[PDB]
Amino acid sequence: ALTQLIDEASEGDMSISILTQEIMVYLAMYMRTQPGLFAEMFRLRIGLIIQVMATELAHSLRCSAEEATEGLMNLSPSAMKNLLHHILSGKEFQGQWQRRRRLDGALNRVPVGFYQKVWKVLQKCHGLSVEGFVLPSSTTREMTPGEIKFSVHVESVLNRVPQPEYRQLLVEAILVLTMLADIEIHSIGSIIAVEKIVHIANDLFLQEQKTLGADDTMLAKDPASGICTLLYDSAPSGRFGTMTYLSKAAATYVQEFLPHSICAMQ
Amino acid sequence: QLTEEQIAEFKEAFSLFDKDGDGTITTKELGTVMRSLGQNPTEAELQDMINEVDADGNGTIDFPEFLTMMARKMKDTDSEEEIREAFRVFDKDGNGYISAAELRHVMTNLGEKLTDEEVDEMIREADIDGDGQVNYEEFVQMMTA
Amino acid sequence: SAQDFYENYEPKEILGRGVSSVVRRCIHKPTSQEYAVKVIDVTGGGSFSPEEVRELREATLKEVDILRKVSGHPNIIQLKDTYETNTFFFLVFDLMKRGELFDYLTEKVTLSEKETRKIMRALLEVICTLHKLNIVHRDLKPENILLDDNMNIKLTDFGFSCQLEPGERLREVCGTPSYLAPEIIECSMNEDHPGYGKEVDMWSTGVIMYTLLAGSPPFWHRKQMLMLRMIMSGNYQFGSPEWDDYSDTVKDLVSRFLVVQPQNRYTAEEALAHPFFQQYLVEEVRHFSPRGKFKVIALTVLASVRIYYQYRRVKPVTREIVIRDPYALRPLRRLIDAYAFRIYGHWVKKGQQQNRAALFENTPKAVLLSL
Amino acid sequence: YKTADFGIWERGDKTNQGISELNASSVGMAKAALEALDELDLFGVKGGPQSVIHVLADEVQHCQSILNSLLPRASTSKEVDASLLSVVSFPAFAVEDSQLVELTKQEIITKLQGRYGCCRFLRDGYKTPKEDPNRLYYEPAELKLFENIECEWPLFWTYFILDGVFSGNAEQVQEYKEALEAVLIKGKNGVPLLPELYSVPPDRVDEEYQNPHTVDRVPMGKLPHMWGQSLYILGSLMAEGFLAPGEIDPLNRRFSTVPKPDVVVQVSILAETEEIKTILKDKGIYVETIAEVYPIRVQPARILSHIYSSLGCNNRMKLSGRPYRHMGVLGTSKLYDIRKTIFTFTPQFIDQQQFYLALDNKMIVEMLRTDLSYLCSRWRMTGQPTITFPISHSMLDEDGTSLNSSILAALRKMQDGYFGGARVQTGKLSEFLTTSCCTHLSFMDPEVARYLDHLLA
Ligand SMILES: C/C=C(\C)CC/C=C(\C)CCC=C(C)C
């Protein structure tokens, strides 16, 4: 049945069917010998693994996706295993962090305990909405924080954004609520749109660079997401990092929903 | 750049802070001092206060840590306020002149027993303008020195 | 022989990995004591040509030598004994349950002033022993530094070390790029400079100071040669908002190791004599002139007043200051760095394209894209 | 290890919705049963090879790979189950790492035990007064209704008593004996009865919601619980010196937690043709050819899998023997005695007809490196494992006159005595005849037999 499911999920393309099971051996090979590469991935998505492995072998030896598709068939099993380990371990051979966010939100790689941190935040809220799909606080009572079924619910909401790079922006956006939630004594008591916090953070990332001397050329919009391409390439921390602007926009949204706030314990 | 002298001055100050020879200054110990000098802050205040300086240290300040504070991290305004404050701490009278006896008042407060003439001498050694008084200008000139 | 290896130790689990060397935990059967074994593949899977196979042995044969020249010292591992085979070279040393300082620096992005002081107090006292025996490391990276359950520093991988003949200065370029002293590159780009001596380790140690206390290398940028001009010229900045909260005694000692000219560098013996590493010994008479007593009582007051003033100054976290500038104030900036390294702590590794500074954006995009 | 089942509680996952899951109790129990039946004569001492149950350590240690990964959890849906006491200590002894046993036992302690026994698993609600006894299934929302008010079964306290007797913790056999003696319901002529479960009274459900494990519970369910009652008497028998752990465990499963030293993996590199023996000789590799090993004859791992398809065949009972399952090194590293001819089977990762992972020589070393590592740490048979490694023409260079560097490094690596964390004693297959697991395949003793008949001749 497992082989039949792979073949049916192969939608007829025979090259992916073997690559699906070929990677499955390597995933199990690294899982048995190095369990630490999957500590940040609770769902092993082989199907996109070929896709995410395609992009890095596309950017390396810069070529088209179809040439990479022909290229992916061409590597040796050891090279294929190494390149997958190149993907999973976090070793690097658009932009630097744009290639580290298209490789971090396409694998649905999330920090240890992030699914155990959404549970804490949702108890202080009514839900968490992404692209207008809500993950309500009723889930917190329904499954335990450590329940993998809950991990699916948080995960399912987070794939409502198709583009991989924007998902990781949502991922660390969720955590800037978590870290602001600890400081804030009161609860928002309403819905929070995790998507929007990135958007004004995109907007607020826009204003500061305009003031400091950025041209319209460098701050170019991502066609689908609506985020500046430089914001995707921006480093996480720092004065002008992505999570400084998202630690910045995770407060103006709480301004309208929470008229009065008290922040303690620094 | 802090001289062997300066480091030594910071060290004896650390000694004046800890009555026990603990090698550390506790939230309680700082307190005994502030109250010695007349600023009685909440035991909680103290905890925060020792925390601002250390951040781990479990409420005890250490000397390597101590010097870190006494090195002039202070801004001109910031120090100015402080320099001024000590000066007031010095004059309960608030007359604005440093009594030889006022110096004694502070030591007596810090539990160090030192000779009466020596005290006059301490001021005298440092005293030119204020015969018998250290003026604030003398105090500031002195601290930098 | 391999029989001699298994007659005394039994490797249980894999601790770490390397380019061709694997670190493995073992049990010493006679003593039942935890020990680490580094397992270097001499043949390297067949990639090593006979020259590299020979050179790796000579590098390894040398490597036993330095680790045999320094022993019993608290803060460098003890090579308990070394076994060589035709295909491997086993080296058994102390077990460090915790990993390298790089892994630790990933967990805590900014390493606190008290913690770094004893960390490097050992490292400088490590550096004194190497220089007194006249042995330079040239490789003082935090991944070369191992920490135990008590956080004690165990300097590791003297793989690039070489003993200078009295008054001789090397020319070979040995070391990953960021932690190379200015004359390392200068000797690489010129023949007139007759070489570098034991003062090399001082610069590398001073680099750890900027990395540990700020979470970034002093000089880092994504292309290779650009980092080099920041090194030889020596343009470093205790930038804001990051580097303003630390005490001023930190900054001067950082510049001392970071001076570009070697002779003016701050050698290890006087390095421990800078005010930071001064320790409070309880039993000191500390006699003082009457002016000296008056300062102490004034300084004792000046301290108490100071502490109340500094604290009063700290601004509680409010909604507005988060909106205007999160990084500016410490508690929120350290937090942003902390949750920066929890999400992308897998993205920091060894090398140039994986350094920690890649996780920090301290400059406007326009200035970054100026050239 | 690869089959989902409803398990010890006949309800599958925590949701109780007919969803079978991989429970550690089933995986652990099968591992112990497989080890218990391993070379066991079902007729006792007065038995023969016809009455011996043959168990393959590939499936036994595959259950270990799942137990180590699952524990201290019972499944992906259960953070812990008190039935894991039936796996860590008794009667399975299926966990070999003592740290795992203590960690799992203490996890049961914190999350399940109260003052009336231990809960089967978190959010159980089997007989909690907050579930309707008519519906066989539970809706998803009902799971949160069972929190902290779950029925508590003294059955698992008999397991802790049994664990203490086996481990030798007189303190453990005392804390759980007085605890069990205060929950035992007296009946008939004063005999103790073990309640199946202790249930929260319907009015007092809210109190245990707020303050956990303090409200008085009423005995419900089966009275006596014939399962739990037996181990209570069994624990009582072995705690008052009427029975020893060895008599109830004659197969010595209780020693599963004692450390096992790693084994020395014997490797006999072979050459498919004489002309490959010269390339290896030119590189200084002492090998026998495939023909020089005769009378010992080597075969692919598949052939061994076909052979076991005749073990347990009974036409009248319509039993077809073992299904075709892939054979790992633990099966293929034994020496097989089929019809008085010694058989060694090539390890499966070198099989080239199945897939293309054997056609990359850099992958042979990588698979071999882990496969020796799997062998040394997981060998539980008499003798030392013997991997017969035949060098094929595909493992040579594209030129055809030189051995590939990756395999070339691999072969010398084995002669020096260490490869992949395993001690390798390289030699000839004849030398390892007496220091190997010589398993006699008695079912072959008078399809695959017809092939083996010509193969023998
Ligand atoms: C101290 C925080 C200051 C601006 C940020 C505003 C915080 C919040 C708006 C609500 C988000 C999470 C809540 C968990 C309960």
| Residue B78 assigned as binding residue | no
For residue D365, the Cα-to-chain-centroid distance in whole angstroms is: 27
Q: Would you call C317 and A112 a contact, using CB atoms and an 8 Å cutoff? A: no
Residues in chain D after which the chain is broken, C→N over 2.5 Å: 446
Q: The tokens 């096992």 sit on which residue?
A: D260
Cα(D452)–Cα(D457) distance, integer angstroms: 8
Whole-angstrom CA distances from D129 to A1, A43, B94, D183, D209 are: 40, 36, 77, 20, 13
Residues 6+ apart with CB under 8 A from A137: A122, A123, A125, A126, A127
Q: Which of C318, C331, C339 sits opposite A243 (nearest CB)?
A: C339
Q: Measuring from atom 8 of ligand 1, which residue has the nearest CA? A: A254
Answer whether A58's CB lies under 8 Å from A68's CB: yes
Choosing among C305, C313, C314, C330, which should be mutated to test the B contact, i.e. which has the most B CBs within 10 A? C305
Q: Would you call C342 and A175 a contact, using CB atoms and an 8 Å cutoff? A: yes
Q: Which of C247, C282, C293 sits opposite B71 (nearest CB)?
A: C247
Q: Supply the DSSP symbol for D271.
A: E
Give the number of residues written for chain C.
Answer: 371
For residue B37, the Cα-to-chain-centroid distance in whole angstroms is: 9
| Residue B127 assigned as binding residue | yes
* Dihedral sign of CA atoms C161, C163, C168, C172 in order: negative
- Chains C+D touching (3+ CB pairs under 8 Å): yes
Cα(A67)–Cα(A50) distance, integer angstroms: 14
Number of H helices, E strands in chain D: 15, 19
| DSSP 3-state of D130 | coil
For A207-215, the CB contacts below 8 A with 24+ separation are A208/A240, A208/A245, A208/C364, A209/A240, A209/C364, A209/C365, A209/C366, A212/C364, A212/C366, A212/C367, A213/C364, A213/C366, A213/C367, A214/C364, A214/C365, A214/C366, A215/C366
Report the separation in Å between the CA atom of C348 and the middle of ligand 1, taken as the mean of its atom positions: 29
Q: The tokens 């978190």 sit on which residue?
A: D122
The partner residues of C93 in beta bridges, in order of sequence, read C36
Whole-angstrom CA distances from C169 to C124, C164, C192, C257, C282 are: 21, 7, 13, 19, 43
What is the architecture, at CATH level 2, of domain B77-143?
Answer: Orthogonal Bundle (1.10)
Residues 6+ apart with CB under 8 A from D18: D12, D137
- Chains B+C touching (3+ CB pairs under 8 Å): yes
Number of H helices, E strands in chain A: 13, 3
The partner residues of D218 in beta bridges, in order of sequence, read D199
> How many Cβ atoms from other residues are within 10 Å of residue B118's Cβ?
13
> How many Cβ atoms from other residues are within 10 Å of residue D160's Cβ?
27
- Read off φ and ψ for residue A12, nearest 5 degrees: 95, -20
Q: Measuring from atom 13 of ligand 1, which residue has the nearest CA? A: A181
Number of H helices, E strands in chain C: 13, 7
Touching chains, B (3+ CB pairs < 8 A): C
Q: Measuring from atom 6 of ligand 1, which residue has the nearest CA? A: A251
A22 touches chain D (CB under 8 A): yes
Taking CB atoms and an 8 Å cut-off, how many pairs form between chains A and D?
36
**Distance from A81 to chain D by nearest Cα, in Å?**
9
Answer whether D114's CB lies under 8 Å from D152's CB: yes
Q: Which of D144, D363, D370 sits opposite A77 (nearest CB)?
A: D363
- Chains A+B touching (3+ CB pairs under 8 Å): no
Pairing of strands D335-338, D341-345: antiparallel
D413 touches chain C (CB under 8 A): yes
Cα(C274)–Cα(C262) distance, integer angstroms: 18
Whole-angstrom CA distances from C187 to C192, C352, D457 are: 8, 21, 75
Residues 6+ apart with CB under 8 A from A68: A54, A55, A57, A58
Touching chains, A (3+ CB pairs < 8 A): C, D
Answer whether B18's CB lies under 8 Å from B29's CB: yes
| DSSP 3-state of A173 | helix
Return the structure tokens found at D343.
């058989």
**Distance from D341 to chain C by nearest Cα, in Å?**
33
Q: The tokens 């801004």 sit on which residue?
A: B75
Q: Would you call A142 and D143 a contact, using CB atoms and an 8 Å cutoff? A: yes
Closest CA to A21 of D352, D21, D366, D355: D355
Return the structure tokens found at D399.
């030129």
Cα(B17)–Cα(C297) distance, integer angstroms: 10
Ligand 1 within 6 A of CB of A187: yes
Q: What amino acid is encoded at A56 in this protein? A: E
* Dihedral sign of CA atoms D250, D255, D256, D259 in order: negative
Q: Would you call D65 and A33 a contact, using CB atoms and an 8 Å cutoff? A: no
* Residues D117-155: b if buried by 16+ CB within 10 A, e if exposed: bbbbbbbbbbbbbebeeeeeebeeebbbbbbbbbbbbbb
Rounded to 10 deg, the angle between the D405-415 and D361-377 helix axes is 30
Q: Which fold has domain B3-76?
A: Recoverin; domain 1 (1.10.238)
H or E element, residue C368:
helix C365-368
D406 touches chain C (CB under 8 A): yes
Cα(C342)–Cα(A109) distance, integer angstroms: 11
Report the separation in Å between the CA atom of A181 and the middle of ligand 1, taken as the mean of its atom positions: 5
Ligand 1 within 6 A of CB of A124: yes
Three-state SS letters, C168-203: CCECCCCCCHHHCCHHHHHHHHCCCCCCECCCHHHH
Q: The tokens 């508590």 sit on which residue?
A: D152
DSSP string, A21-70: HHHHHHHHHHHHH-GGGGTT-SS--HHHHHHHHHHHHHHTTT--HHHHHH
Interface of chain D against chain A, CB under 8 Å? 65, 76-77, 79, 122-123, 140-141, 143-144, 356-357, 360, 362-363, 366, 370, 373
| Residue C21 assigned as binding residue | yes
Answer whether C364's CB lies under 8 Å from A209's CB: yes
Q: Measuring from atom 15 of ligand 1, which residue has the nearest CA? A: A187
Same fold, B3-76 and B77-143: yes
- Read off φ and ψ for residue A237, nearest 5 degrees: -100, -175
Cα(D335)–Cα(C304) distance, integer angstroms: 82
Ligand 1 within 6 A of CB of A254: yes
Ligand 1 within 6 A of CB of C335: no
Contacts of C308 in chain B (CB under 8 A): 34, 39, 41, 49
Give the number of residues written for chain A.
Answer: 266
Closest CA to A50 of A22, A89, A78: A22
| DSSP 3-state of C152 | coil
**Ligand 1 atom nearest residue A180's Cα:** 2
**Distance from C147 to chain B by nearest Cα, in Å?**
19
Q: Which of C349, C358, C365 sits opposite A209 (nearest CB)?
A: C365
Whole-angstrom CA distances from A253 to A131, A187, C185 are: 16, 13, 50
How far the first Cα of chain C sits from its last, in Å, is 58
* Dihedral sign of CA atoms B52, B54, B56, B59 in order: negative
Domain ranges of chain B: 3-76, 77-143
Cα(C362)–Cα(C340) distance, integer angstroms: 14
| Residue B136 assigned as binding residue | no
- Read off φ and ψ for residue D5, nearest 5 degrees: -145, 160
Q: Measuring from atom 3 of ligand 1, which residue has the nearest CA? A: C319
* Ligand 1 mutation target, pool A137, A185, A261, most atoms within 8 A of CB: A261
Report the separation in Å between the CA atom of A180 and the middle of ligand 1, taken as the mean of its atom positions: 5
